Amino acid sequence: NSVTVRQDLERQLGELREEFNALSQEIAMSQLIDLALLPLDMFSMFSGI
Amino acid sequence: LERQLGELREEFNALSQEIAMSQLIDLALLPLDMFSMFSGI
Amino acid sequence: QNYGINLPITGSMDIAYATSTLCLYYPTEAATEINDNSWKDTLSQLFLTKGWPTGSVYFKEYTNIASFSVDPQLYCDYNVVLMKYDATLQLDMSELADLILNEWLCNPMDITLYYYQQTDEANKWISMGSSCTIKVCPLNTQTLGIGCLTTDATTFEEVATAEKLVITDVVDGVNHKLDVTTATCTIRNCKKLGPRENVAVIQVGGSDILDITADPTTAPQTERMMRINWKKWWQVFYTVVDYVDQIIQVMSKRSRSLNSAAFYYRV
Amino acid sequence: QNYGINLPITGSMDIAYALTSTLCLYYPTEAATEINDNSWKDTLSQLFLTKGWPTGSVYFKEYTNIASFSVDPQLYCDYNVVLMKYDATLQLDMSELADLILNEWLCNPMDITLYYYQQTDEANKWISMGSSCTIKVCPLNTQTLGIGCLTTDATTFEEVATAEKLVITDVVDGVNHKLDVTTATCTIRNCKKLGPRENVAVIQVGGSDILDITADPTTAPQTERMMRINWKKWWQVFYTVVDYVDQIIQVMSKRSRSLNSAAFYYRV
Amino acid sequence: QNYGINLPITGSMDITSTLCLYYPTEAATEINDNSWKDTLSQLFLTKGWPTGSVYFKEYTNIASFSVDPQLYCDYNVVLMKYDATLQLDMSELADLILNEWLCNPMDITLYYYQQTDEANKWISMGSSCTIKVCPLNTQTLGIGCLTTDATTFEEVATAEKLVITDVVDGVNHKLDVTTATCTIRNCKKLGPRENVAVIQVGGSDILDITADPTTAPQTERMMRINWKKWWQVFYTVVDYVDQIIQVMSKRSRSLNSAAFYYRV
Amino acid sequence: QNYGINLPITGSMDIATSTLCLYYPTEAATEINDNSWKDTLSQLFLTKGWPTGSVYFKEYTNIASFSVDPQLYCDYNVVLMKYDATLQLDMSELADLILNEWLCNPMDITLYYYQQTDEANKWISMGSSCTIKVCPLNTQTLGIGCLTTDATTFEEVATAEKLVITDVVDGVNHKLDVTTATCTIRNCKKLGPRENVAVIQVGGSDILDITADPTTAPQTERMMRINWKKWWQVFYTVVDYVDQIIQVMSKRSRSLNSAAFYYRV
Amino acid sequence: ASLIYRQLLTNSYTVDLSDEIQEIGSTKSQNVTINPGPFAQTGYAPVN
């Protein structure tokens, strides 16, 4: 029982776009192709966050 | 809950010899799903 | 040691590379006009949307331009000073912007057992405190004053009074005497060295009453001095919130200080 | 010239090699009250003069009570030495005074009337300085529910310090907390312990040594910047610390933040 | 499996739990909460501990904590509130709680005794134990005391809830105790214990874990910290717990490996 | 470290002081009527060869009394137990608790339930007065023959006992109702054989076992027995062949805390 | 034939729903705040 404080406003689309575009820098290739061969799944989508 | 597991353990430990192998392979050919692994029980 | 000062950098152009804190300062005019008690939390939740995690924004309050003037303090990886415009407080606005926008390294000052001088052009004298009235005298080679008899102070040539903060520049090439209001102020002899990227100024209203160097030839307006007009404080706050990415892009953090004072005291 | 871009530096082991440094001494009261003179400063001055040190280079700033000296210890001077008069009843404050003024704390301010907080690493502390601090802390579980304290009011939390002027809390990492002080009395700042400070040397004149600078229980080191001597007449303490002031000076070093090359590296 | 041998191991150069806290009563008295243990349990959960296996035990006084001392738990952090009074008591207490003591009983009404190795002591515990001694010549005759006397003895300790007695060795001594009040076991130190870490609060790390004068062997288990409030100490304990865990090892006797090798 | 348990020793076929104390019940020394008997056994062991002051003596006034936290001190124990036609079960459970070492955990009884995993898991309850009440519950977590809200209809398996060895059916949780301030239960695993202690029974036939298993109840090569009318014959006889008791034991199994079990919270 | 394992791995989202399907069948209750810590005494004034 308490006056409910509010939510936290989810980070906006735009800066999200910019920051994901930024993370493209440190991407390795060999590892990327290796991973891309592997098939993930629904359970293997979210169980790493 | 563990107890039924142990009984089934004893059971499985003696049904490893009274199984067939040829039919075993020829079964392993076909693919199983949710529908044929527990709905023909 | 020296981190590398004498082993120069090597670079290239052929290679393709393709929790921090932020404070605010607002004059009490806003604290008056707001008329709320839960507002700072709203500002927090907003800077969340713009990219700050909770616990990374703090607020500070100053009541006058003159009040905030004494003994500046800084508190975050990035300092944003929201300055109200006025028409009779111009030199104070420029002095505060000069002090906080620019670096200073000074030695203490006395009146007791010395005279003082500037060795070059780019040195200034700073006075801060509760009551700062400054009168000064230059001399000849004869240790004699020209325009002020060395023994009597009432006919001195004053430069400051009825003021809180003053940054004065006197001419090179002669010792000086000063009637500082000692117990009611304090003065230092500082050398500005270079600009800093750890402060920014947003002036609400007014028409660019600012100079960051008292040079008549160079009144260098920078990219950190920003000026918007206001008639409603919430609009000012929001509009600042809308381009905080831009403001962060205009500042840089590698120049922060260890103490919360925007200069460096080295006896 | 090339600043702030940390580039390697080539030295060598092939070539051997064949004033402006300013001591800035502090001192407590009852010493003075027992000295029974107003020229002692001048005697120290002339002695340092004969030792190779300029006259007018040494200044004496005095602290009254240890708890009084705890506030705002901006010890700005080329080289600093602090002689503290020991107490057998005031210990923790000495330890934390040493901790503060011997390390470098880069801190950001807080507004505890609004924000939750949480410490980050074993090198993150909360310094609290001022007149009379009475910290009130209330830990929380993951969705802001009081644990051992009630958040629907203020007076049922768990206090960690009362009647203190300067105290540096360390909290369990990774949990949010509610906080209260009287924010017209004293101020708390969230400091990151960046790296050791080398401008200061603290020596204690009294009982046994207690000094440790790590809030780590396991590591209770004895640095060099912490020294201890006995006494029954302060005159000999002054005279002696000037007799070996050469060695003391050779032990410390220039402040690694004001060297004209520490530019854009946190204070210069 | 293969116990009871001392079988050399080879190698190469290419290749639940319990955290256990004892505390003095005056602390919780100063706290005036009761759900506190539950709070610190939640915090230990947050640092990674399983919910509902961490136990806090309460002793009235360090004297009391000295008698019948028993630690049975995977990881013990024992706090001690210093006093300038019991420096001997605290030293010998940390000692008894730092070592592995191979012990046998004694009957001082029927024999003589000795110390045969430098790793040998006579430990005594009881309610009100006050022991007296009389070393004996090679002719089994008393000196400055007589086997017939009980008062010309040489007093070595007095109503100490605990005592760790030592004498010059290779020489016999007739003693004086009260056995239906106190027990004295002949014990031999073997190694250091890894299930215990002694955090002293207040003081200056004065411990000595050997009757050896020539050295004061300081180690990685006798830690020290200062205090102004108790929750301060407990928070330092919980947050910094990981390095402490790295200090104290699994009980080298505990593993099912030391069997028939003077396994506990 | 590990002493090399992961490494196997190899052998060949080419290559061809400790303590010893004795336990005894008061009735013996009572019929002895002296104080100069302890001197006697001492000097006699000295004669047969032991540096004097290596043989000690504890006394136990009653099987029930010594049935509280037995402390097997010496590197060798030869406990002379007195048989009675009525105290059989207590004797049996004691003789069990001392020949085989146990690894023991404490239980929390008013906050949870408990279960035994292996075949060699037991509970041992000790106290000046012990009373064990047990109520099994099936999967769905309800009482059967016992209303969990009450305790009176429970199945009482021990009454004001000094020591109780209890076993349940492996893996069916129970509500445990016990006298808590006059007895404590310890959940223990029977590790294996301990080799410092032998028990010499005087009286009737062998009731003593080392198990609770039906099909196994063997006369352990260590658990000895004699006849008796005069305790002096008992002690003398012990001293006669005492070498054989030595050569039956093994002086490489002494514990480092001197309790019948290893306490592990 | 290994399809059953890849299946049981893959379609492991729906389980979530089912759990609250238990909850919608489940009863729920709350427990009011308890007041911890010792409590002060109070006897009686001198009664005449």
mmCIF file of N, CA and C in Angstrom, chain F residues 67 70 93-94 96-98 100-107 116 121-127 130 132 162-167 176 178 183-190 260-263:
data_model
loop_
_atom_site.group_PDB
_atom_site.id
_atom_site.type_symbol
_atom_site.label_atom_id
_atom_site.label_comp_id
_atom_site.label_asym_id
_atom_site.label_seq_id
_atom_site.Cartn_x
_atom_site.Cartn_y
_atom_site.Cartn_z
ATOM 1 N N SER F 67 25.080 -41.902 27.511
ATOM 2 C CA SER F 67 24.366 -41.843 26.243
ATOM 3 C C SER F 67 24.133 -40.415 25.767
ATOM 4 N N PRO F 70 28.500 -38.793 23.428
ATOM 5 C CA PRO F 70 29.706 -39.553 23.752
ATOM 6 C C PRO F 70 30.929 -38.944 23.091
ATOM 7 N N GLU F 93 21.930 -49.037 19.953
ATOM 8 C CA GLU F 93 22.085 -47.796 19.209
ATOM 9 C C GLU F 93 23.380 -47.088 19.582
ATOM 10 N N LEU F 94 23.787 -47.156 20.852
ATOM 11 C CA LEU F 94 25.087 -46.603 21.210
ATOM 12 C C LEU F 94 26.198 -47.324 20.469
ATOM 13 N N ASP F 96 26.170 -48.778 17.814
ATOM 14 C CA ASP F 96 26.178 -48.365 16.417
ATOM 15 C C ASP F 96 26.846 -47.005 16.268
ATOM 16 N N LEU F 97 26.427 -46.031 17.077
ATOM 17 C CA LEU F 97 26.837 -44.647 16.848
ATOM 18 C C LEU F 97 28.342 -44.457 17.008
ATOM 19 N N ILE F 98 29.041 -45.450 17.567
ATOM 20 C CA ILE F 98 30.444 -45.256 17.913
ATOM 21 C C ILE F 98 31.403 -46.035 17.026
ATOM 22 N N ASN F 100 30.914 -46.728 13.670
ATOM 23 C CA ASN F 100 30.909 -46.115 12.355
ATOM 24 C C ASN F 100 30.774 -44.610 12.499
ATOM 25 N N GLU F 101 31.597 -43.878 11.759
ATOM 26 C CA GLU F 101 31.586 -42.426 11.827
ATOM 27 C C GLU F 101 30.400 -41.878 11.042
ATOM 28 N N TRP F 102 29.871 -40.755 11.506
ATOM 29 C CA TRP F 102 28.697 -40.137 10.917
ATOM 30 C C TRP F 102 29.007 -38.703 10.524
ATOM 31 N N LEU F 103 28.390 -38.256 9.433
ATOM 32 C CA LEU F 103 28.465 -36.867 8.996
ATOM 33 C C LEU F 103 27.095 -36.253 9.233
ATOM 34 N N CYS F 104 27.026 -35.270 10.121
ATOM 35 C CA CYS F 104 25.764 -34.833 10.700
ATOM 36 C C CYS F 104 25.471 -33.366 10.406
ATOM 37 N N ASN F 105 24.224 -33.098 10.014
ATOM 38 C CA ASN F 105 23.656 -31.781 9.812
ATOM 39 C C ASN F 105 22.550 -31.537 10.827
ATOM 40 N N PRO F 106 22.379 -30.299 11.269
ATOM 41 C CA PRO F 106 21.253 -29.984 12.143
ATOM 42 C C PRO F 106 19.998 -29.780 11.324
ATOM 43 N N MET F 107 18.859 -29.900 11.988
ATOM 44 C CA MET F 107 17.570 -29.800 11.325
ATOM 45 C C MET F 107 16.821 -28.596 11.867
ATOM 46 N N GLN F 116 15.064 -38.415 3.838
ATOM 47 C CA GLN F 116 16.347 -39.093 3.763
ATOM 48 C C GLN F 116 16.579 -39.631 2.361
ATOM 49 N N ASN F 121 21.072 -43.249 5.274
ATOM 50 C CA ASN F 121 20.806 -41.989 5.951
ATOM 51 C C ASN F 121 19.968 -42.295 7.185
ATOM 52 N N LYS F 122 20.312 -41.685 8.311
ATOM 53 C CA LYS F 122 19.575 -41.897 9.543
ATOM 54 C C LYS F 122 19.356 -40.569 10.240
ATOM 55 N N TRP F 123 18.585 -40.611 11.315
ATOM 56 C CA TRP F 123 18.492 -39.490 12.233
ATOM 57 C C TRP F 123 18.885 -40.019 13.597
ATOM 58 N N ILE F 124 19.623 -39.220 14.349
ATOM 59 C CA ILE F 124 19.971 -39.570 15.713
ATOM 60 C C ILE F 124 19.569 -38.423 16.619
ATOM 61 N N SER F 125 18.731 -38.722 17.599
ATOM 62 C CA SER F 125 18.230 -37.733 18.535
ATOM 63 C C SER F 125 18.872 -37.985 19.887
ATOM 64 N N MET F 126 19.459 -36.938 20.456
ATOM 65 C CA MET F 126 20.108 -37.029 21.753
ATOM 66 C C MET F 126 19.554 -35.942 22.653
ATOM 67 N N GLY F 127 19.466 -36.254 23.933
ATOM 68 C CA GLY F 127 18.990 -35.306 24.915
ATOM 69 C C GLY F 127 18.672 -36.003 26.220
ATOM 70 N N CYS F 130 14.164 -37.507 25.404
ATOM 71 C CA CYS F 130 13.879 -37.411 23.980
ATOM 72 C C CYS F 130 12.540 -38.055 23.649
ATOM 73 N N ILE F 132 10.149 -38.502 20.094
ATOM 74 C CA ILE F 132 10.154 -38.338 18.647
ATOM 75 C C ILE F 132 8.752 -38.591 18.115
ATOM 76 N N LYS F 162 17.113 -41.378 26.153
ATOM 77 C CA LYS F 162 18.408 -40.718 26.193
ATOM 78 C C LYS F 162 18.995 -40.601 24.797
ATOM 79 N N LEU F 163 18.844 -41.643 23.987
ATOM 80 C CA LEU F 163 19.307 -41.640 22.608
ATOM 81 C C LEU F 163 18.303 -42.407 21.770
ATOM 82 N N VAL F 164 18.050 -41.935 20.556
ATOM 83 C CA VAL F 164 17.193 -42.648 19.621
ATOM 84 C C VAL F 164 17.830 -42.622 18.245
ATOM 85 N N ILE F 165 17.866 -43.779 17.597
ATOM 86 C CA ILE F 165 18.188 -43.884 16.182
ATOM 87 C C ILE F 165 16.854 -44.035 15.468
ATOM 88 N N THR F 166 16.518 -43.074 14.622
ATOM 89 C CA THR F 166 15.298 -43.160 13.845
ATOM 90 C C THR F 166 15.611 -43.302 12.360
ATOM 91 N N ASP F 167 14.793 -44.100 11.675
ATOM 92 C CA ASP F 167 14.811 -44.188 10.225
ATOM 93 C C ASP F 167 13.387 -44.131 9.704
ATOM 94 N N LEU F 176 7.637 -33.189 11.548
ATOM 95 C CA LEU F 176 8.334 -33.655 12.736
ATOM 96 C C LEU F 176 7.902 -32.839 13.945
ATOM 97 N N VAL F 178 8.701 -32.689 17.920
ATOM 98 C CA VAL F 178 9.683 -33.170 18.876
ATOM 99 C C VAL F 178 9.699 -32.246 20.080
ATOM 100 N N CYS F 183 15.636 -32.193 23.647
ATOM 101 C CA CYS F 183 16.258 -33.145 22.743
ATOM 102 C C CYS F 183 16.496 -32.477 21.400
ATOM 103 N N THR F 184 17.554 -32.904 20.719
ATOM 104 C CA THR F 184 17.881 -32.407 19.391
ATOM 105 C C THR F 184 18.138 -33.578 18.456
ATOM 106 N N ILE F 185 17.635 -33.455 17.231
ATOM 107 C CA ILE F 185 17.754 -34.478 16.202
ATOM 108 C C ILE F 185 18.819 -34.031 15.219
ATOM 109 N N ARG F 186 19.655 -34.963 14.797
ATOM 110 C CA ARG F 186 20.707 -34.679 13.844
ATOM 111 C C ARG F 186 20.593 -35.641 12.672
ATOM 112 N N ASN F 187 20.465 -35.064 11.477
ATOM 113 C CA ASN F 187 20.338 -35.819 10.235
ATOM 114 C C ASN F 187 21.740 -36.227 9.817
ATOM 115 N N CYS F 188 22.024 -37.524 9.810
ATOM 116 C CA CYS F 188 23.390 -37.970 9.605
ATOM 117 C C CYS F 188 23.498 -39.036 8.521
ATOM 118 N N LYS F 189 24.620 -38.999 7.815
ATOM 119 C CA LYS F 189 25.002 -40.026 6.865
ATOM 120 C C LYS F 189 26.075 -40.903 7.495
ATOM 121 N N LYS F 190 25.901 -42.220 7.393
ATOM 122 C CA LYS F 190 26.868 -43.180 7.920
ATOM 123 C C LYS F 190 28.022 -43.312 6.936
ATOM 124 N N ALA F 260 31.429 -38.241 18.623
ATOM 125 C CA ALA F 260 31.035 -39.422 17.865
ATOM 126 C C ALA F 260 30.705 -39.115 16.414
ATOM 127 N N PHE F 261 30.575 -37.844 16.061
ATOM 128 C CA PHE F 261 30.081 -37.428 14.763
ATOM 129 C C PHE F 261 30.845 -36.194 14.317
ATOM 130 N N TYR F 262 30.635 -35.799 13.066
ATOM 131 C CA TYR F 262 31.216 -34.565 12.558
ATOM 132 C C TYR F 262 30.098 -33.563 12.295
ATOM 133 N N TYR F 263 30.063 -32.511 13.105
ATOM 134 C CA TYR F 263 29.017 -31.501 13.064
ATOM 135 C C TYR F 263 29.200 -30.667 11.806
#
